[PDB]
Amino acid sequence: TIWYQTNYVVPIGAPTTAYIVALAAAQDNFTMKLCKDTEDIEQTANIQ
Amino acid sequence: ENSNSASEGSTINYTTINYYKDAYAASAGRQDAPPLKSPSAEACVAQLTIGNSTITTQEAANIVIAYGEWPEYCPDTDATAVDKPTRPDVSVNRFFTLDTKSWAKDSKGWYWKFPDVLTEVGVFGQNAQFHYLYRSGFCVHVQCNASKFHQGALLVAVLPEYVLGTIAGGTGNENSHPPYATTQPGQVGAVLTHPYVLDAGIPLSQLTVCPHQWINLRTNNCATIIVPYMNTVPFDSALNHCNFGLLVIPVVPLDFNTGATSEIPITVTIAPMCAEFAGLRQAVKQ
Amino acid sequence: ENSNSASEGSTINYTTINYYKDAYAASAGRQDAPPLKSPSAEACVAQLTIGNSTITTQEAANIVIAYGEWPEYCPDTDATAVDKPTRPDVSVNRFFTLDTKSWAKDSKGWYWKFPDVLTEVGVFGQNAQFHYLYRSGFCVHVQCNASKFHQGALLVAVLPEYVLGTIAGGTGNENSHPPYATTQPGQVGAVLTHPYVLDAGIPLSQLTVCPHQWINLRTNNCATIIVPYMNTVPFDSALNHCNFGLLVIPVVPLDFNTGATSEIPITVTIAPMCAEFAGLRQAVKQ
Amino acid sequence: ETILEVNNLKTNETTPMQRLCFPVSVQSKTGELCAAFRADPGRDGPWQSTILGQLCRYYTQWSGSLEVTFMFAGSFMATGKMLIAYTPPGGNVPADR
Amino acid sequence: GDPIADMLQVLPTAANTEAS
Ligand SMILES: [Cl-]
Ligand SMILES: [Cl-]
Ligand SMILES: [K+]
């Protein structure tokens, strides 16, 4: 969760809404196990 | 001679005169960064991590060490209670953030009492309630952001034994007293009614004689003060006694032009340091 | 060859055959007081003191060390969670006494689940609720006094992973399940409806294959069992999972002549040992 | 690191680019929640858009520490502080700061 | 220096019997 600790503050002349981009990655102690097929690709018809 | 003088046990040696077997009967005689100027961490993007929490400052010369003393557990030479204390460590020595205050152009100022602020928060709170005896230091971090076009200055200070007084009925004839909600406002803190005299008949102008730091909007957006345990006894009740008060007072009022963000909050984040407890029994809230 | 056999990392060496790059593809091959007989403290007025509490037994050859292993904090080689755990020590590793049970001539028997019994008791309870991860051993002490003219025998045993079952509607056609109050009865414990099968389709007669001690009224008035942490993971939720159950069952019914004291209670006193917690957040009751 | 679709709303599926960043703005009430999401790398949701999430799906189990980087793209004149928390298992989204 | 002082079960064959 990300909360406002103080506030988003600006002087006159700057936008009162902005955006944040969030990125993610694994650290060096990360590993994976038991190789398997993914749910994120399917095939419902012929690939021509 | 019996070594029962009040000065017995101090580093300073005095040359006195005596005609009795008790040392305290003797004459006063004669003797034969600075702790009070708010020593910076150096004088004694940055990141202070404690427990599972991290705040981000900028410089170590921007962290005040109250009276030049870092928090520590009670040494055996000063302890009196004989039970083994519990020092829970990471579950209690970590950063807790309280309700945020809103700084307005006409705000008077606020105060919080320690350890009252956290007696009902987290594992620290539980330990404070389950034990008769408590003791700890604190890392106090006050946060306030504003733009390069805003202006204002908060004095952030730690006043040990912050006893509050009343206006004595206005006329001074009434011996009234501050009520419980005023002396120990808890987590939300309280507002000063007469900041000039700190609601206690003493000048705000001299508050800088106490550990403090300024939050001058044009230069900084946070203040950090590390406070050691201070008391006339080595451990005490976290419920009955507040060792110190935190004061945040706008000495130079907040100002900005119409259209600039007017919602300027002030947030207090505090971490007990070297918290220890003793005299275990059932939980007591007050 | 990849060292991915299930037996990899054990003290026993096996001589196996393999034709593939993965060790687990290999044949089973051939290999090339007692931990199960409830080892007494000696085999591995007395007073056991822990924290601010003391119970009084008689002999160390009367204290069972479950599976011959004394409780210990999780070693670094077995740990997986990376945060520094909190080990509050004396505030949690101390004796807690639960509600007393009343032994009657027709009592069926009782059980308690661990750590469920203490999740709402003292500083241990608070830590169990504030942290996702919990781990500890226990010193279990069961007390029962009666006169030299009373008779009876309680089997006091520790059954790891005590999963309860139902009578399946009596007929065996209903796939019913034990309700929450039955699987985790809390501090007050619960009563067995079919002690002969431990309410789980297994024989009470073989329960002695688990760490146990008898309380035979003519010889002793208490049983003490020290239990190490047992689980397939190094830490776990104190709320979702009970590592073991304590069973107190009158195998030889209580008896005495009319006029002898008929109010014969059974009291359970337990002390967490090496309790540690991790994964701090807000308090969660369940 | 790859981009997390924290702003994965049903209402922006037809303008998918908007899923790549989320808003922060002047608040009138303090301590507000800005965004929340689970930390399960292989679960449906924000992590699915990351290559970490997609490779996780070619495996059954994982282990280790993760990192979430937040990049503020407002103006140089905008300032403020946010509290970013990771709540271990036990309940639901914390109700307040 | 320290401010606070407080801080195999079954063998390959069956056991033999020895003459009394
Ligand atoms: Cl007043
Ligand atoms: Cl049943
Ligand atoms: K033999």
Residues 6+ apart with CB under 8 A from B114: B138, B227, B242, B243, B244, B245, B246, B270
How many CB atoms neighbour CB B90 within 10 A?
19
Residue C50 burial (C-beta neighbours within 10 Å; 0-12, 13-18, 19+): middle
* Residues in chain A closer than 8 A to B259 (CB atoms): 12
The answer to whether the Cβ–Cβ distance between A10 and D21 falls below 8 Å is: no
Q: Looking at beta carbons, which residues of chain B come within 8 Å of D97?
A: 97
**Block residue for tokens 């991915």:** C4
Q: How many angstroms separate the CA atoms of A13 and A15, rounded?
A: 7
Shortest alpha-carbon distance between residue C127 and chain D (Å)? 13
Cα gap B270→C280, rounded to integer Å: 17
Minimum CA–CA partner of D86 in chain C: C281
What residues in A contact D91, CB-CB < 8 Å?
A: none
From the list B280, D92, D66, C169, the residue with the least C-alpha distance to A24 is D66
* Beta strands B222-227 and B63-65, pairing class: parallel
- Chain C within 8 Å of B134 (Cβ-Cβ)? no
Cβ-contact B261, B254 below 8 angstroms: no
Name every residue whose Cβ is closer than 8 Å to that of residue B77 and which is 6 or more positions away in sequence: none
Instruction: Report helix, strand or coil for D81.
Output: coil
The chains found to touch B (3+ Cβ pairs under 8 angstroms) are A, C, D, E
Question: Who's near C95: CB < 8 A, 6+ residues apart?
Answer: C50, C51, C53, C54, C55, C139, C141, C269, C270, C271
Q: Which residues pair with D12 in a beta bridge?
A: none
Amino acid at D67: E
Q: After which residues is chain E broken (C to N over 2.5 A)?
A: 7
Domain with B160, as residue range(s), is 1-286
C91 and chain B in contact, CB less than 8 A: yes
Q: Are strands C212-216 and D2-3 parallel, antiparallel or unpaired?
A: unpaired
Q: Are B97 and B268 in contact (CB under 8 A)?
A: yes
The residues, ordered by sequence, that sit 6+ positions from E8 with a Cβ below 8 Å of its Cβ are none
Are D74 and A19 within 8 A, CB to CB?
yes
As given in the structure block, the two tokens for residue B74 are 């009670």
Separation of alpha carbons B192 and C134, rounded Å: 44
Question: Locate tokens 């679709």: which residue?
Answer: D5
Counting Cβ atoms within 10 Å, is residue B64 exposed (0-12), middle (13-18) or buried (19+)? buried
Distance CA C208, CA B160 (A): 62
Distance from CA of B99 to the nearest CA of A (A): 10
- Provide the token pair at B23: 């040392």
B165 C-alpha to center of ligand 1: Å? 6
User: How many independent structural domains does chain B possess?
Assistant: 1
Given a contact cutoff of 8 angstroms between Cβ atoms, the answer to whether D70 and A20 are in contact is yes
A20 closest CA partner among B128, D6, C134: D6
Q: How far is CA B142 from the centre of its chain?
A: 12
Tokens representing D10?
Answer: 């049903």
Which residues of chain A make contact with D9, given a CB cutoff of 8 A? Answer: none
Contact C38, C211 (CB under 8 A): yes
d(CA B192, CA B203): 13
Q: What is the token pair recorded at B82?
A: 């004989």
Here the tokens at position A22 are: 């969030």
Interface membership of B56 toward A (CB under 8 Å) = no
Selecting from C279, C280, C282 the residue whose C-beta is nearest the C-beta of D94 gives C282
Q: Which of B151, B122, B100 is closest to D83 using CA atoms?
A: B100
Ligand nearest to the Cα of C166, by number: 2
Residue with the two structure tokens 């830590």 = C127
Per the CB < 8 A criterion, the answer to whether B175 and B181 are in contact is no
Q: Residue B31 forms beta bridges with which residues?
A: B14
Best of C119, C129, C277, C281 to substitute, by most chain D Cβ atoms within 10 angstroms, is: C281
Give the 3-state secondary structure of chain B: CECCCCCCCCCCCEECCCCCCEHHHCCCCEECCCCCCCCECCCCCEEEEECCEEEEECCHHHEEEHHHCCCCCCCCCCCCCCCCCECCHHHCCCCEECCCEEECCCCCCEEEEECHHHCCCHHHHHHHHHEEEEEEEEEEEEECCCCCCCEEEEEEEEEECCCCCCCCCCCCCCCCCCCHHHHCCHHHCEECCCHHHCCCCCCHHHHHHCCEEEEECCCCCEEEEEECCCCCCCCECCCCCCCEEEEEEEEEEEECCECECCCEEEEEEEEEEEEEEEEECCCCCC
Chains D and E touch (3+ CB pairs under 8 A): no
Residues C226, C231, C235, CA angle at the centre, nearest 5°?
100
Nearest residue to D81 (alpha-carbon basis) of D19, D36, D27: D27
Residue A31, chain D, CB below 8 Å: the answer is: yes
Q: Residue B14: what are its φ and ψ, rounded to 5°?
A: -115, 145
**3-state secondary structure (DSSP) of residue E11:** coil
* Interchain pair C133, D87: CB under 8 A: no
Residue D51, classed as helix, strand or coil, is: helix
Hey, what amino acid is at C105? K
What are the b/e assignments for B235-267, b being 16+ CB within 10 Å?
A: bbbbbeebbbbbbbbbbeebebeeebbbbbbbb
Which amino acid, C270?
A: I
B256 touches chain A (CB under 8 A): yes
Experimental resolution (Å): 2.5
Touching D: C residues 69-88, CB under 8 Å: 80, 82
What are the b/e assignments for B126-152, b being 16+ CB within 10 Å? bbbbbbbbbbbbbbbbbbbbbbebbeb
User: Closest Cα to residue B262, out of D79, A10, D75?
Assistant: A10
Asked whether B176 and B168 are in contact (CB, 8 A), the reply is: yes
The closest ligand to the CA of C193 turns out to be 2
Scan residues 1-20 of E and list those with Cβ closer than 8 Å to B: 3-7
- On whether the CB atoms of residues D85 and A24 are closer than 8 A, the answer is no
Looking at the CA of B191, which ligand is closest?
A: 1
Rg (CA), chain B: 21
Rounded (10°) angle between helices C122-130 and B122-130? 180
Six token digits for residue B191: 């507002």
* Helix (H/G/I), strand (E/B), else coil: D20: helix
Reduce the DSSP state of residue E12 to 3 states and report it: coil
Q: Which ligand has the minimum distance to the alpha carbon of residue B178?
A: 1
Q: What's the token pair of residue B4? A: 């029962």
Strand order through the sheet with C151-160: C190-191, C110-114, C244-255, C151-160, C212-216
SS3 A9: strand
Task: Give whole-number Cα distances, A1 to B21, C166, C205, C266, D42, in Å.
Answer: 70, 42, 53, 49, 18
The string of DSSP codes covering chain C is -B---TTTTSS--EE----SSBGGGS---EE---TTS--BTTT--EEEEETTEEEEES-GGGEEEGGG----PPPTTT----SPPB--GGGTSS-EE-PPEEE-TT---EEEEETGGGTTSHHHHHHHHHEEEEEEEEEEEEE----TT-EEEEEEEEEES------TTTTS-------HHHH--GGG-EE-S-GGGTTTTS-GGGGGGSSEEEEETTT-SEEEEEE----SSSSB-TTT---EEEEEEEEEEEE--BTB---EEEEEEEEEEEEEEEEE-S----
Amino acid letter for position C53: S
From the CA of B96, how far away is ligand 1's center (Å)? 30
Cis peptide before C211 (omega within 30 of 0): no
Question: Chain D partners of C133 at a C-beta cutoff of 8 Å?
Answer: 88
Tracing tokens 């079960």 back to the chain, one arrives at E9
Chain B residue numbers with beta carbons less than 8 Å from the beta carbon of E7 are 73, 87
Q: How far is CA D22 from the centre of its chain?
A: 8
CA-nearest of C281, C285, C271, C284 to C136 is C271
**C-alpha dist (Å) from residue B235 to B219, C158, E4:** 39, 41, 15
Task: Check which CATH number belongs to the domain holding C23 and give it.
Answer: 2.60.120.20
Alpha-carbon gap, residue B14 to B41, rounded angstroms: 33
Separation CA B54–CA C157 (nearest Å): 46
Q: How many CB pairs under 8 A join B and D?
A: 24
Q: Which residue in chain B has the smallest CA separation from E5? A: B76
Query: Alpha-carbon distance A40 to C5, whole Å?
Result: 31
Q: Given the structure tokens 């210990």, which residue do they identify?
A: C72
Nearest CB neighbour to D90, from listed C80, C82, C132 = C132
The Cα–Cα gap between C158 and B251 comes to: 66
Residue of D nearest to B149 (CA): D77
Interruption sites in chain D after residues (C→N beyond 2.5 Å): none
Q: Which two tokens stand for residue C40?
A: 């007494």
Q: Sort out which chain D residues have CB atoms less than 8 A from B267's CB and list them.
A: 81
The answer to whether the CB atoms of D83 and B145 lie below 8 A apart is no
Task: With CA atoms as reference, report the closest residue to D76 among C210, A15, C78.
Answer: A15
First to last CA, chain B: 46
d(CA D85, CA B240): 33
State how beta strands C151-160 and C212-216 pair.
antiparallel
DSSP 8-state assignment for residue D89: S
